[PDB]
Symmetry: D2
């Protein structure tokens, strides 16, 4: 029972035309629907649900909410009961609040971000199928992102004021959503302050992550690639589409994943990383990174 994986992220964009072509031409996503409010829904080729990204028209960048898929409908009532006993108010959005999406349990993380849990989303299948499928589809565009892999949230952190929502988010998703901690970055005196945490429900190194910051916001959303080669191909695609790159291709010590950071036309940061890195396991020791490194 419980959370399976990240379900979708809803992003604020200023230019919908430029944002849609970015996630299509650079990341290889396909648009699956547009609602009557102007929001655009896209999915990756190796995903089988209706969408993993929502672009909403806005006057600014940022994130609206973050959604995670749970195993079955009855998990929503159980998780809801755990969350409110912890002290977080929840509410249940009924099915149809978002198109092609079932009912959703809505609540705010301690850091202030809105998080949703759903059990039901429309099945459309992957672009390769499931009866004698090919390993990859033809006509793939751009980097050919497999799936939306995880999301790193900037969480308000003021050690002098006694505020560390990275720690509070980390406790919340572990005790209420049964995530387990895989890696952490420790700062402060003797590493007594959690500045970055990576947590998992799958056996990939992280499905959610929190990094400290002056205010709560969105650091980036990330997309999975197969190999070190596909990262290089992704860098070539970004060069052809004139994409503003943040960090050049380099292996992250975290996740052991080789990654590229770049932006969409509205300023939201995106990551294409390759490789599993390691098998995340509930009995695996937490990889600790110290501030001096």
């Amino acid at each position: 029972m419980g959370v399976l994986r990240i379900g979708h992220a809803s992003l604020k964009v200023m230019d919908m035309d430029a944002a849609v072509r970015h996630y299509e031409n650079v990341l290889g996503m396909k648009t699956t629907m547009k609602d009557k409010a102007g929001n655009v829904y896209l999915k990756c080729w190796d995903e089988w649900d209706k969408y993993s990204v929502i672009l909403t028209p806005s006057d600014q960048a940022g994130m609206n909410h973050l959604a995670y898929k749970v195993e079955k409908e009855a998990d929503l009532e159980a998780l809801q009961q755990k969350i409110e006993a912890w002290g977080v108010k929840t509410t249940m959005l009924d099915e149809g609040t978002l198109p092609s999406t079932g009912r959703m349990l809505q609540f705010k993380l301690p850091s202030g971000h809105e998080m949703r849990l759903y059990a039901s989303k429309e099945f459309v299948g992957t672009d390769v199928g499931n009866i004698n499928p090919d390993p990859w589809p033809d006509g793939l565009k751009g980097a050919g992102a497999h799936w939306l892999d995880h999301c790193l949230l900037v969480c308000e952190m003021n050690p002098e004021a006694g505020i560390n929502t990275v720690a509070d988010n980390t406790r919340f998703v572990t005790e209420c959503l049964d995530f387990f901690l895989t890696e952490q970055v420790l700062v402060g005196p003797g590493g007594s302050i959690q500045a970055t945490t990576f947590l998992a429900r799958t056996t990939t190194p992280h499905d959610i992550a929190f990094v400290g910051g002056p205010t709560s916001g969105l650091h980036h959303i990330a997309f999975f690639l197969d190999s070190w080669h596909d990262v290089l191909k992704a860098a070539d695609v970004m060069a052809k589409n004139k994409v503003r790159i943040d960090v050049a291709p380099t292996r992250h010590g975290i996740t052991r994943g080789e990654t590229i950071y770049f932006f969409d036309p509205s300023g939201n940061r995106n990551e294409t990383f390759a490789g599993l890195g390691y098998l995340a396991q509930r009995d695996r020791p937490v990889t600790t990174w110290t501030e001096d490194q």
Copy 2:
């Protein structure tokens, strides 16, 4: 709760000297202990428990048993209760039956293979550590296998006699051990016969697998590699060590993984495969392969 991943495989070897150097020089494992009965225990560099492979002296090849690690000790009593309600007799080996290994729940699969579940094995840590670790260790030998990934068992199957232990094993590990089916190979009229099944507890495509055969036995044990390049490097290592190769480097339609099949000096088949392939998910449709392919 429940099974985490494959824990170890115990293999019968005829020449212990030749078998130990094979798993050390070809696969990159390290020997961690030898018991007073002559059995040798080895682990991979990216594993943190004491051992994942047991070599036992014998007059023949084959497998002794297969072991899977569970989340906590109390899971053994719960799984034991489910297994016997299904109709499989179990027994509890106490801690110390194997060195550095806690108590084990022992039972036979419908196909006749002996399977064990343990919760506790001695921690020794990975070869890269967990405080600011490197992505890979220096002095790595051979293919540098990350971890024992899965095991494919040959399961007795006689469709005319009404015997299909691939199906019975598949039902057993799903209903009793809460595995979920990720891929299958269907044969017979209209694909009405399961000849091969792949099942998972992690989010890797398969942690156990069953293939039909005239008699029940061991098809191969498999080891994980990072990338397509490490497979090539593995093929070069096998050429330097004069290893009997079964299948040349080629991508498997199953798992989407690029793999090599080869043998140890006693005849047991080994696999080095690279890549996650896809994220196995309980809501993902089962990849079906038909006999005509």
Copy 3:
């Protein structure tokens, strides 16, 4: 002065429709012209001349001739003079004998194969251009072969009858065409018989190659790929197009290149190999392979 590289190979095909779609869909070549005799001319994307492959309709497979490009027109008279002093009759085909192709010096190798040298072929440029070009073109099909790299000829060899055209071809192309030997396979007593030779004009390991055989013929023509990954992608393409594979993906000890062998619909063998392997140099010792290996 002298030979630059392999220029084109003319192959006999039985089904022109099936052969053209093979070299287009599998190897990624593009058809550039068809003459009034039904012959089809194709080039690779990273080539700048008009064509590197000629498909001629025929009732059998095999090779018509092999063509190499020389640095300047005046090299043809000089090479012609060296060849006839060696004892090989030559003839000069005038410009236009083949469409878009200048005059050609024609002669037969000692093994009996027809070889041609030209200095002038129509320029059409590569598919990426030469003013701020991209590293690779979009819409690339199949394996995306960079260029026709080399050709391995089966050369009549009968050691008991005193016939070894592999040796005679090797002496001919070295003394007359200033090729240099990079690798060889030695067989017979103490390696006193050259069974396979690889020779170069470029600094790639081989631009022509000869292997012994009962009769003189065509072993394969080969196409260059960038990396180990592109070989895997090539294997996936051949699986999608139902291509008859000869040898699975494996690294060749020769050339150090990772390669795949496969056939076109008429039976001619093709090779897609990746990597430079090493820098061929006139002062580099000849890599010798012995029969026992």
Copy 4:
């Protein structure tokens, strides 16, 4: 006849201990001799001559001279005659001026750099051999650089003062040493000024290169790696050895090669790049890069 490839580069280092361990541990070179003046000579594993790098103790960084190997001894007299007819004074250092090195033709490029040509250097062979060799050697250290590939020189350039030694060097090595231009970077009005040139004798994209600068000096020396993966491995090695990186792993539009720039302990810049990129050919159009890009 003529130049084969870059032969060696002589660098000034301030800390010989720190410099030698850098080229050994990071680049994988091996020290082959030390002369009585304190100079240290190193070679790469896939080279067969005595050394490709000379470290000389000094109070500053920079380059002493650059050396290229020619095909035969008699080429030195012929090249010497061409060079002085062009207007460059030459001198002949006799054999033994450098240990294990034959006689050398010495002269200064128009940019002021000292260049040497030799025909004879002591043979020691590659680390894999030449009788049934392995594709790569065991116990390889660091990035495992195959060979010193090329050298980029900063050449004094003052367009207002009428000084452009990039152009003068480019004319010199083409007309006197029979190099051919493969790529160029054009700046100024309408691209009427050569700011960077790449030239070849091999069929690799460049064996020497010149970039404009206020003063003449050394930009970097470069080492060849096989694949995109070996570049990643190189970045991991530099991280383990605490190497000052200049440019993160990224594909260069020039050469199409994926590269890393970094420094030795004395400040000299080094490059590890992978891949052939394209086959350099005397009939290939010069790849032109414009200033706006």
